[PDB]
Design a protein around this ligand. Structure first.
Ligand code: NA
Ligand code: NA
Ligand code: NA
Ligand code: NA
Ligand code: NA
Ligand code: NA
Ligand code: ZN
Ligand code: ZN
Ligand code: ZN
Ligand code: ZN
Ligand code: ZN
Ligand code: ZN
Ligand code: ZN
Ligand code: ZN
Ligand code: ZN
Ligand code: ZN
Ligand code: ZN
Ligand code: ZN
Ligand code: ZN
Ligand code: ZN
Ligand code: ZN
Ligand code: ZN
Ligand code: ZN
Ligand code: ZN
Ligand code: ZN
Ligand code: ZN
Ligand code: ZN
Ligand code: ZN
Ligand code: ZN
Ligand code: ZN
Ligand code: ZN
Ligand code: ZN
Ligand code: ZN
Ligand code: ZN
Ligand code: ZN
Ligand code: ZN
Ligand code: ZN
Ligand code: ZN
Ligand code: ZN
Ligand code: ZN
Ligand code: ZN
Ligand code: ZN
Ligand code: ZN
Ligand code: ZN
Lengths: 402, 402, 402
């Protein structure tokens, strides 16, 4: 149950909400309509609960991948920017906010992995994955290593696996074909074979996780790491002279990191859809609009062309957008759960030598089908639970009857 | 159990079985073949048990929706009426007796929802749904209400939901496409939004069932109700001056009620397949044949054109047919179990405001899949039991085993 | 691991492994590369276990139907014979060693069911199924029966069932269409009906299994039996004058038995793929190669055209190939488990009179579905316990923690 003649916005606490409120303050002075910017605890799980009944905020800010599930449940309204406003943002971002052909959210910020190198240890970072083994031997003489990054989570190893033509799901016609999985094709096989080759030649360690990767780079033990903008602040605190650049190529093809997009979606239950559109399109998604948010807490790379060109003077931001443009957009579909499950197991089992690359990737298809079944069962029994609570008490109850 | 040279017929106890026996009596005098008409308890439940082993009646009379289950199991014979006989019944009725492309039964009677109105309170019934909110306000001044009908079943509320373009399944080329579902489209959405708008504007009550509606109309508390031919006899006893007319139109589109068709199938195991065709086509499905049945217990609207024009002199029977021709035929496929489960919950949660119309219809897909899963689980274990049964017991065992 | 510059082969103990070693000995003499031929217990179970981790033989010999699973798990390398070599083997055998459109093994020997007749009791065997009822009545006057074979397993009864148009799954364009199942069609109906009618007319007994069938023919109580080459040795010992000929035709159409093709597959983890191709194509798949193996233990009908013509001078081998050439290759897909489960029960129930032919075959569709859901249930929980195991190795316990 939301209000009217006013706007209420939900954005996460680690974002520039104070700056966003100042955009809402600018909105009030022009239209006379009050904007409240709330940052409630765990709004990502709160929003599906409250919007189902017709409540919650007018606008919600979150990563696009979670919006797929909101649109599935009919919680988000179809946004209607004209052709001219769509040319204002980078074309690829709009694909991240599409569900069932319809547009469901406005892209705000773009997030992806880049290659972070130590400038003092390595002044000219490698442009290819293939020249890293040769670089490791040269650094091992100085008591250092070439590259250390998280190998436990498929999110970090995917950029290399996807390089030569591996994909999560095929995206064409504006939809993801769930019968077209690209986990054990020729390109993903070569990608992961290179990773396993790096481990059995002792150029990397299969035990390396996020904490070990970060700690190593910030202490100056390793020349390179692979990480997102979320980690820049901690590297700043270590006093390490670092640079952020384009990811290394593999077989001449660029690394394809997953692209995450911070998006603004309109609650389908909102009586202020016309107002939200006016706010987002003409007050927020403008140079002056994003600037207020960015000065509170940096947005990183942004969807708006005109303002991205301005931030891109920071070479670390330019590198985020470059790797993003060369990358795969994170699929917003529910099948993505089964994907992480299968690929996490596949990478772990290949890297440990417990399974061949070929057999580990082949097992992913059967392992993801297994997860599907478990979720299918979860949904089935949750439904039966609700059904019983629906009929026993809602209708006939001991002390009334059907 | 059966023979060659005689016919045995199953028809439900609440039908005109004596009148059917009269048609069998006329059949015996012209061809010299004795026809028995039986009406056993739970014959709809018994038929699949005895027909599977090769027994049961030569002909079974039941609603067409249950015939899909019989044809799936191969208990029904493919009927062969020529083009000339197919023009004798209403074209749309043949679609009810079609499973897997082939015709499997003869259409006898047609049954559908109609608008029943109190003539004393409302001489000119509304032609549109849009004018019922305003019509309720006038009647509330006299302590009465405009419309009260069952909202607990989706069968009664579907007419409105399907009006603007909602559909259960797409029907083309004589086949249902189970991938093409229309519960979550703009048409179904608008229809259900109007139903919910009526309840929150206090024109209708969210908890109105079949009992509460029938008793209110028959006492003269409400001006209109929605119900089928099965309920007329109860209104007759109440002395209420009532009429039966076409359902109100929504957005200029007609309400589309589901159409049940009383049908006569021929057993697959029947050695009298030719005799059953002669009896059903040239003796029962004539003006004389249906008359004898109709005078024992009213058939409602009939499939045969010639005899329907005769019955349509009764304004109630003409309206049952009119609503049936404007509505969609009840699908006989097994995916219909899950459809009802999902839609029942979708409507209830929309009516009670636990879920917004958009969100309530979105969850339908999820609940239809849930019922498919735990339905598939039932067949899984049923099969496994039958297996270990014949395998372990019927076969290898202590005495002359293995 | 298997080493390099050496070749190691796995073949079942009941095949001519010594003769294969002779070919290995010849390979060693021309090229200087030693070939070991191991015959481990239960290899068909061991191979998936060891080849997954990268160990196992360089070459494995097994029936093609098990290879589809090995290819699914990516344990088999794609073989590369040129057009000129593929003409050397019977075109239909290449369809047995195909998975995902890729060739994954070399065809060695063909195995299929044949009609075996007693010469002393029946000098001229029936060419058609239709005359067998009449032929049984002539033999019951002499205290004998016309035909006795295993009716408990669908493998044996299928030839008759498939003849008029029955099929497991449609094999077109190289792939198997799972949605197109030919168990419930008119052809399979008629086949099973004839079988059921044979039992109903006391020409065969529904309780007749493999052991009863073989013992009766080997004692000389029955004129005909249906069985493969695997049983010839037992008939030889009984001193019975027997012949092996083409299966009887049903409705002028040939009986379609399932074809088993013994095959040589190269391990995907083999560092000797080039050497295995040299060995198999130029040393084994030649007149002298197969002869060496055949003299140790008869291969039956072979895949190689040249050596097959030479073997066809044996009337029994010519028939095995003839019946195989008119029959169908047994699908190498996982869905075959559920097919056997369904059809086995279908035929059992039709033979016993528990269900009509129509009702029995109709239930096979739902029974096959039930087994599939059972199977993907087994797989789901197997991957869940693997996940729980994998978690620990990564995980926290009283030896260490995250
Ligand atoms: Na709020
Ligand atoms: Na395509
Ligand atoms: Na970055
Ligand atoms: Na520009
Ligand atoms: Na070669
Ligand atoms: Na750790
Ligand atoms: Zn907070
Ligand atoms: Zn949070
Ligand atoms: Zn320097
Ligand atoms: Zn190296
Ligand atoms: Zn600026
Ligand atoms: Zn500025
Ligand atoms: Zn500003
Ligand atoms: Zn109470
Ligand atoms: Zn009887
Ligand atoms: Zn009765
Ligand atoms: Zn019904
Ligand atoms: Zn006619
Ligand atoms: Zn009103
Ligand atoms: Zn049409
Ligand atoms: Zn049409
Ligand atoms: Zn459609
Ligand atoms: Zn209420
Ligand atoms: Zn009640
Ligand atoms: Zn007559
Ligand atoms: Zn008449
Ligand atoms: Zn008349
Ligand atoms: Zn007459
Ligand atoms: Zn009359
Ligand atoms: Zn229509
Ligand atoms: Zn069902
Ligand atoms: Zn026992
Ligand atoms: Zn016992
Ligand atoms: Zn030689
Ligand atoms: Zn051995
Ligand atoms: Zn087999
Ligand atoms: Zn071919
Ligand atoms: Zn190709
Ligand atoms: Zn006979
Ligand atoms: Zn086809
Ligand atoms: Zn036995
Ligand atoms: Zn040679
Ligand atoms: Zn063929
Ligand atoms: Zn440790």
């Amino acid at each position: 149950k939301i209000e009217e003649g006013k706007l209420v916005i939900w954005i996460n606490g680690d974002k520039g909400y104070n700056g966003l409120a100042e955009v809402g303050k600018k909105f009030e002075k022009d239209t006379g309509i009050k904007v409240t910017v709330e940052h409630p605890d765990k709004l990502e799980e709160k929003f599906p609960q409250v919007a189902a009944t017709g409540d919650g905020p007018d606008i919600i800010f979150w990563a696009h991948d979670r919006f797929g599930g909101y649109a599935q449940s009919g919680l988000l309204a179809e946004i209607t920017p004209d052709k001219a406003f769509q040319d204002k943002l980078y074309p690829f971002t709009w694909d991240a906010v599409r569900y069932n052909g319809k547009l469901i959210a406005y892209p705000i910020a773009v997030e992806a992995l880049s290659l972070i190198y130590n400038k003092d240890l390595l002044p000219n970072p490698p442009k290819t994955w293939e020249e890293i083994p040769a670089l490791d031997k040269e650094l091992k003489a100085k008591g250092k290593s070439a590259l250390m990054f998280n190998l436990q989570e498929p999110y970090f190893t995917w950029p290399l696996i996807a390089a030569d033509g591996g994909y999560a799901f095929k995206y064409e016609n504006g939809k993801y074909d769930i019968k077209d999985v690209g986990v054990d094709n020729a390109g993903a096989k070569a990608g992961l074979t290179f990773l396993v080759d790096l481990i059995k030649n002792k150029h990397m360690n299969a035990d390396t996780d996020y904490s070990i990767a970060e700690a190593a780079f910030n202490k100056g033990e390793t020349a390179m790491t692979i990480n997102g903008p979320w980690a820049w602040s901690n590297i700043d605190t270590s006093k390490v002279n670092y640079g952020v650049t384009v990811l290394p190529t593999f077989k001449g093809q660029p690394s394809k990191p997953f692209v995450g997009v911070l998006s603004a979606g309109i609650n389908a239950a909102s009586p202020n859809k016309e107002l939200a559109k006016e706010f987002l399109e003409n007050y927020l998604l403008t140079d002056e609009g994003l600037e207020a948010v960015n000065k509170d807490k940096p947005l990183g790379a942004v969807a708006l062309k005109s303002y991205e060109e301005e931030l891109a003077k920071d070479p670390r931001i330019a590198a985020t957008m470059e790797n993003a443009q060369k990358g795969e957009i994170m699929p917003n579909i529910p099948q993505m759960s089964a994907f992480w499950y299968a690929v996490r197991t596949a990478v772990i089992n290949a890297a440990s030598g417990r399974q061949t690359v070929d057999a580990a990737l082949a097992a992913a298809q059967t392992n993801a089908a297994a997860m599907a079944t478990l979720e299918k069962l979860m949904k089935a029994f949750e439904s039966l639970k609700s059904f019983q609570q629906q009929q026993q008490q809602q209708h006939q109850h001991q002390h009334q009857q059907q």
